[PDB]
Structure formats: C-alpha cells, structure tokens
Subunit: 317 residues, 4 copies
C-alpha cells in the first residue's frame, strides 16, 4: 500500500500515543522544504528577469516562519543568525531546532547540489528559553535529517524507529515513501575529502589516504568523490557506502564544519542507519558543545571504514 510522509508520521504518532506536537512540527518543516525546493529549481525566475517588464536568506525565512507558526518550538539556531532565536511566548512549544536552511549555497553559482539540514531536541531544562537550550549533545536528538535538492528532491528522516527516505513528487506536492528502514553497507569503496589541504594534514590522515590509494593487501584502490557540498557527499555515502572526511588544517585548527546543524544531524542519521561518526578523539554525538557556532572535525560513514581510520589514528598516539 502507498504511503506518504504525513501519513507515516501520523501512524507512528498514534502508535506512540503522543499529543501530536511533533507531527505538527514535521508537517510544517516539510511545507517549508517544498517551498525551498521550488525556489532552488528556479520556479518564477522569468519574473526576476522582466517577463512582465537571496536564496539562503529566503530559505532561512521560510524555515523560521513555518516552525514559529507551528506552535511547537521555543529556541531556533540557524547557520544564518549570529545568536539563537527565541520564539515569542504566545507561539511557544516544547522543541528546540538547529538547522542549516541552505547548506552549500556559496557555490550555488555552479548549480552544485545544496540541502537543508536539521536536528530536533526536546527542551531539556525548565529555565526560561535561551541560547543554552541548543547546547545539548547529539545523543539527545529526537529527530534529525535532511532534504537534498539534487537531481530530484528527497527527504531523509531518522527517528527512533529508523531511517526512511521520501521522494518529493512535484506533480502532487507529496513526499512518497520509497525506501523503508534503510541500512548503510558494512564497508564501501569510495573516500571523500578535499585533498588540497594535503600540506597541512596530520600524519594519521596522510597515512589513511595513502592506504586508500596504495592498499597494502593489493586489493583494488578506493575511488574518490568530493562534491564540496556536505549534504550531497553524506547522502552518497549513505546510499553507496564508504567514508567522508573533513579534518582540521592550519586555516581551521578546530576543524571546519559546524557541530550543531551540520555534524550532529549527519551523525544521528549515520548511527540510526548502522554507521559511525567520530572527531578522531570521540563520537560526534558525545561532544558537549559550549558555543552555538563552534566547529568540529568529522570522519563518518560505513562502520568498517571508520573503524579502519581509527586504528591509524591510534598508531600516532
């Protein structure tokens, strides 16, 4: 029998005997994603060029407004805003949302894939809502996932019940369930990082890459892929398996990607699909943050691939 995003969430909600507040949140976010998808594919661009005589800003406004108006949220952190946004009292609900409304949009000039990344927490302290409420470790996530605006638009939703993939059918504006309860390959054959920082790599990263190009067990070398847009690179890793790396360099001594709305959501999806995500020193989901725009190094993907890198890391003390 056919299933949609809304219907899947309502049945999981009735199964868990919840109040419906989370369903209202997710229904609002998906409405936002459909408007973002339509703008990213350039519907109406002809009016901007005079047929009748900014995208990361628009995306941020769409997500902010649909979440506020859902009556289900209280604190909102966005890549686009210097401080956390506190929802007004008459619209407050019980959830905290960290999001990147249009990740990769700096290179959208070349029509690279871009995406929306989100992670949802229950507000945990009873204090008055503040920026501190978004500083929970990723272990605390209630739901997280992403929308990828690639050759098609897909919504990946990870919850306690697992990971599920929904394809936007733009003819009816419905997210159709196409892949149920997905799991990542135990081991893949692709590695992904920006090798232009090879001069600054720590010795452990240098060796691990060398093992991928020149395998000691004369097996086939890995192929390399690096789009430069995290949502595209992570989703390929989920669908095909392998490993994705963004380690620290001289320009970025604490790493480059953001912990709250880039690293933690992707780590949650990976673990719910049976994968891994580490900083080298610890699991990403175990890092306790102190600043909402703080950075972290990340190595994630199929479990056999992340484990092999951790052994090389251990060799270099």
């Amino acid at each position: 029998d056919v299933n949609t995003l809304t219907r899947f969430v309502m049945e999981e909600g009735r199964k868990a005997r919840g109040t419906g507040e989370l369903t209202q949140l997710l229904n609002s976010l998906c409405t936002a994603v459909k408007a973002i998808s339509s703008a990213v594919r350039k519907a109406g661009i002809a009016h901007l060029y005079g047929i009748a005589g900014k995208l990361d800003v628009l995306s941020n406004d769409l997500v902010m407004n649909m979440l506020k108006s859902s009556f289900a949220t209280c604190v909102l952190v966005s890549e686009e805003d210097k401080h956390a946004i506190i929802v007004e009292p008459e619209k407050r609900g019980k959830y905290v949302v960290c999001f990147d409304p249009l990740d990769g949009s700096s290179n959208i000039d070349c029509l690279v894939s871009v995406g929306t990344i989100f992670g949802i927490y229950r507000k945990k302290s009873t204090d008055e809502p503040s920026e501190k409420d978004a500083l929970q470790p990723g272990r605390n996530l209630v739901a997280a996932g992403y929308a990828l605006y690639g050759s098609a638009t897909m919504l990946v939703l990870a919850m306690d019940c697992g990971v599920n993939c929904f394809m936007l059918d733009p003819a009816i504006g419905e997210f159709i369930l196409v892949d149920k309860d997905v799991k990542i390959k135990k081991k893949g054959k692709i590695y992904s990082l920006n090798e232009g920082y090879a001069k600054d790599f720590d010795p452990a990263v240098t060796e691990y890459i060398q093992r991928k190009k020149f395998p000691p067990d004369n097996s086939a070398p890995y192929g390399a892929r690096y789009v430069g847009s995290m949502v595209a690179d992570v989703h390929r890793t989920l669908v095909y398996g392998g490993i994705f790396l963004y380690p620290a360099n001289k320009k970025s001594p604490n790493g480059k990607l953001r912990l709250l709305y880039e690293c933690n959501p992707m780590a949650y999806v990976m673990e719910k699909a049976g994968g891994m995500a580490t900083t080298g020193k610890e699991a990403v989901l175990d890092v306790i943050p102190t600043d909402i725009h703080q950075r972290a190094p990340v190595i994630l993907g199929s479990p056999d691939d992340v484990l092999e890198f951790l052994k090389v890391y251990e060799k270099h003390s």
Copy 2:
C-alpha cells in the same frame, strides 16, 4: 529585455539568413530536455508506488523521437545505441547529432547531478546517410553544449557567436537567458580529477598534481573538487576557473571518456570561452575520429593552468 532560448536562436538565425532547419532542431531538442528534466525530478512517481491501487532508456527515446520528427536530421549517434541511427527518408534533414542523453545516470541512485551532452554537425557529402557522416573532427562543430539537471536545470549553448547559459523556469517551461558571452578565468585555483587511481597515474600527472598541493614558491595551494559527473565538473570549471583532467595512463593510453558526445562538445564550449582542451599531445578538437564510440584523454580549463600542465607533461616526454 528578457530573452529565451527559442527567441535567441531565432534572432541569430535571422541574422545569419539561414533556412530555419537548425532552429527547428534546437527547438525539438529543448522539448526533449524539458521532458527529461520532468522525469529526472520524479514527477508522477506516486503512480508507480500504487496511489491508484528506464530513465536512461526514456531519455534516449525522447531525444531520438523528437529529433526524427523535427525533419532536420539524417544521422543520430547516441551513447545508448551500438550503431548510428539513420532517419527514415520521409523525415530526413541536413544535420548530424551526437549525444549522450543522460550522462551520469549510472550513479543517479544518490541524486548526483546528471546531464545531456550534444554536438551538432552539418552533413558534409551528398552520399546517402551513413555512420561515416559522424566521423568529423571537433573543429567542424556548428553548435555544442549541455543541459545540467542540477540544483536547477540549465542549458549551456556554444556557437560561433560565443557561449550563453539558459535557466529553465519550470513554472512555464521556458529557458531564460542569464549569462551572455561568458569567458573563463585566465588562471584558476581548483584542480579536478579522481585521485583514488593515483597508483596508475602517468608520472607527469603525479608531478603536476603535487605542485598544486606543494607550491615551490609561497603561493597558496589549490583546492580539490570531483563530482564524478562530467557535466557538473566541467560547468564548475567554466564558472570558477581551474583545470579538469581525465588523462591517459599506461592502462588506458586513450583515456576513458568518449570523443564524439563527451570530449568534443566540452572542448568546443571551453575554446569558445577562451579556455583550452588538450589530450596532452594535441588539441582535442583536432583529433580526426575513426570510430563513433572511440575514447580520448582530455585536460581542460583556464589557459595558464593548461599551459603549466603541458610544461610538466613535456618535461616527461
């Protein structure tokens, strides 16, 4: 004034005082591109999953059927067909079209960007149409380009007048002109190739890539990008500058990419934009082919970068 692809081609055609066959061909090609785009974005997928109780094949059928019914073609070469297709006599016109209807479609499960690549020639003899009519050197091209089905759908068209970029507005089905007479940066800061196969690199490729990462002076090392879909990587090279390599090695003395409907159309776009495209031994556009599916190595992008690669390449000759 706002401009569309159909309006622009009509103006160039009336300017050159042509008969209109080339305009009919390009109009039919664009109807195919819009139908491919609609299917690539998964319109109507809900009916496939039972709401009421092939993509590379379909792309090929769309381009093939729209070209045959244009009355403007006589020989059609496609990546999908072993032999050249000869249009039935009642529908023959004067142009030869070589095309890849859905390049990158092998990895379409991960929603990577995909594309359609085409190059259009004038039939040169009055003999009866045969496969030989497609064996012209790239220098002979009348028009070439690609459609990128990325975060948005864009059509890039190169002719004698230069390179122009058109954005598909899906709300009305029109290609809107957004970048006129584009030129590539004289020197860039990005190199693009599959470094996972470094074990097999030609020694000149090894040394050249090492100089991008480890500059002998004190300039900044280049960044790395590799989507793995030719249309996406080539379009980024056009927009941002730099270099793209799919070179020859000892295991593949002729490269991997196909000359007729991958290498030549892209070489043509680059040269019309003030860039370069070499095999290492000569310009891609000067190769005279002997087989419709023959392969060729290609190194293309900003001219200062391509010239610097040839200096290292010649050092190892």
Copy 3:
C-alpha cells in the same frame, strides 16, 4: 499567520480530543484530490500523443478515491456513483466511517473542458451489526463532514463540518491547500437562478410559475440573471459565492427527480445549511429523507433562504 488544510484539520482534531481517524481520512482524501487535479489538468498528456514514440478519467478518479480511503484504515463502507453495490472494506483495514462520494461529477461533458468536481459525504457507522450496505442508508442529518473539490480555473477544496464551511486554494508549486476563506456564509437573497429551461414542456405547474416570476416579476422590478453550467459542483459553488438558487425538481415523467440523494443531494444540502442556506425537495428537507436504496433519486432546490422560500410558496399554491 498562514494556515493549511492539514494544519487546520489537526488543530480542530486536537481541540475536540479525537483519536485522529477522521484526520487520517481527510488527509488521504486530500492526497487523492491533488492527484485527480493533476490528471484533470492533463499533466503528462504529451506522453499519450507519442512524445517518446490509459484509463478514463472517471475510472481513474474512482480508483484514486477508493484506494486512498481503503488505505487510510478509517472507513468500513464506501458507496460510489460508479459501483452498483456498497464496497465493504476488508477486516484488516476497517475503520469506523462510511463515505458516500461521486469521484468525478460532470465528467460526461469533460470533452468541452467544463468544470468538474469530486463530491463527498462522511458518516459514522451507527449499528453494531457487521458492516453492510444498510449502514449507508442514513438521512443527511447524520453527516459528520461533507464537501467538494471544484476543478475550475483553480482547484479549491470546500470543507463543511459542525464548525462551519472553509475554502482552501491548492498551490500547485508546493502542493498545499492554503486557507483563503474562513467561516463562509451565503447571502440572504441573490440575483441568479440556475436550472435547465430546455425541458420546460415537462415542467411541473409550480416550476413554470416560479421561473415566470423570475423573468417577468409582477412588481416590474429587475429580472434575475440566469446561469447553468450543467455541472452540479460548479453551479452549486457559484450559488455559495454569489448567492441565489439552484433547481433540479420533480415532474410528471420523473416524480422523484434525477440527482442522487446519497452522494450528490445530501452533501450539497449539508454544505448549504452550514453556510446559512436552504435545500428542499418541495415536500420535505433533503437531509430528512430516509433512503431505502443507495442509488435512489431525489429532487433538490437549494441556495439563498429568501429565494428557496419564494419557490415553496408557489409550489404550495399548486397543492
């Protein structure tokens, strides 16, 4: 703040403390309405004419509505204009609601691109017996929600429940029904009457007089305008938006009318009453007729209350 159909129905459901079964039903029906809309607007018709080198629209609409309702797990008996007998939902998918619907009303003239629509009425099963066709034989008084989708110049969903009538506009760029008209009410009296005057030779004597009063008013005031699309959902929706009267009455050749009581007359009667209008057969209220056959017919006269009352006065004068 913006509001959508799903968001609006979730709030009324949370407010009334329901289990969610009705919300799943309506959300499933709304998905079916978007797929019908997409097909009615001829998306993909290029493929039927050979661009790369199937079913009738009323069959496909029936298949879409039937399939989404079954898969909602919210229904047990389904009556459709297209099926001779009531459909009894299999046990593993049964819920507590009975739905009577016309999946594509007016579709016989869809060759001229006239407006077409989907009509629906939803009941709660009343007996504890095993579900059967009898469960669909309730009077209109018992309806829980009813409405229609009009596939016109735009696609709109009109939903009537106890809280009133609300109008939602389909935004095809994102596939959402956007709330655009809240708590709608019909004018007390209008300026348009709607019926097929081509069959006047067979008119009841009372229908002849009332129409005569509309064209040639005894107090030489201004005549009414006449409009008749011939598609019930379009004529009834115009009656709601502009006011006036719609007639499909009984005569000597057809003493019971022509329109179907369960899935045409009753749902339109319910919408009208919730918006402050009237709907009669001439002898009794549409919503009070007790049916004996799921495909039985009934005459209908509906619209603005002053207009329907003036008709009843003429009908009674002719005994």
Copy 4:
C-alpha cells in the same frame, strides 16, 4: 507523430516562405499564455498569504511586454487599455494585435472558466503606426483564436489552413496538438444564452427560443447551457454543436460583447470550422469598425441552427 504549437507554426511558416516575424510573434504570445495559466491556477499564492513572513492587470502586462520585445508588432489594442499602445521605434514590427488578456475575470471569485482572446492583422500604412491600423474588419484577420483556462488549458488557433487545438501539458510547459483541422456539427441539440433578460428579447429571439422548447414537429426539445464566460460557451458550441446567442435588443441595440477582441476572433474561428456567425443582419467579419472598443451583437454556431434562427429573424422583417 507528436506535434507542438511552436513546431507546427514554424513548419507552416517555412511552408509559406515567410520571414519569421509572425512566428516570433506567436511564440512570444504562447510564452505569455503559459505565464497567465500559471498565475490563474494560483501557483505561488502561498507567498501571498505569508509563508515566508491584479490578475487581469498582470495578464495585460505579460502580453504587452512579450509582444513589444518580439520585434514583430507596432500597435497593440487591449480590453485593459483606453487607447492603442504604440511600440517604441527600435522594437517595431509589421503586425497589429487585438487582445482580451483575461476574459470573464469579473466572476473569477467563483472559479468559473476564463480565457485569453486574440486577433492578428498586418498593419496598413508605411508611414507611422497609429490607432487606425487596428480598425480593420474581421475578413482581414491573419490568425486568431483563444486560450481556455478550464478544467485544463487549451489554445485554439485558427489560420488560413484551418482550426487546430493544442493542450498545454503543465509538466513540460509545451502545447500539444490534440484535434486537427476541426469542423463543427451541422446541427446541434443545445442553445446558449442568458434567458433571465427574456423580458427584453427581440420578438424573433423570443420565437426562436419558443421553437427549441415546444417543437412544432413534435421532435425532442433542445437542452440549455450558459456558463457566462464567452470562451467557455463558445468552446462548448464548437466541440458539441448548437447555437450561442448574445443578441441585440432595444436596450442594447449593438449588443454587449466587444467587436475587435471578442466577437471577431470567435467569428473567425467558427467560420474556419464550417460554422456561422451573424449579428442577425450581417456576418460579424463584415462589420467595419470605427472605434477600437465598439460593441456588436453575435449569434454563432452550427449552420443549420443559425440558418433556422435567421429564417425566424427574416420572418419578422
């Protein structure tokens, strides 16, 4: 073989050895019609109702701007404009267009069908464009037709070669040919007019309608249909046969519909499909206009029905 509007017009135009100005015109008009359809079906209305925090006017702006920028027109007459619009000198071409950009839009609150009506003339002087260029009789039309925004969107185009019907496929923004060289039924079973104004009827209109309800030859009476949107009522008459009336009476001796951009294009379509269109006294296409906004009565449809009406009309002298 599949055919589209732009491909069909180019083929007829090359067949006639024309310069391409009319094709550039009709292609530009077809871009405006697709933009009007998109707005009429309410695409993007969510942004109007605040998701991120006029229609007849937009239609006139779309048609005016696409026609001006086509370089194919010099004078434009619109239902929305008091005086003719004169195209500025650098954009002038040789054609005159009379149009109603959104007919029936006064009742768009109830979502009744609406449409666009157009008629195209070659201009008259070689001097300078002026209003007089739009004052030609319907016999002079080069092409005319309408777009119906009903349950689907259809463009009906009549030229010298006949009447052809194109269905807009919104998934690709292309007009598909679906009914070729259409001809009307010789006699129908439906009459169409506003009977609420019967108190004002001409005696012949009264007698003719009486014959439809109470036939003297005891045959079956006709049915009645009246949408109130001329494009919808006229299109039903073409597809099903019958008669459509908006006749003269004492209060409106010249009718209500507009001659230049409502009566003439529909009269042309009817005659090209083998039907008739009269004022009662003469053929609509033979009226010579003196004012761009002058009115005329119209009776059109199947020939046996119009002849039967004229017989009653002639009996009353």
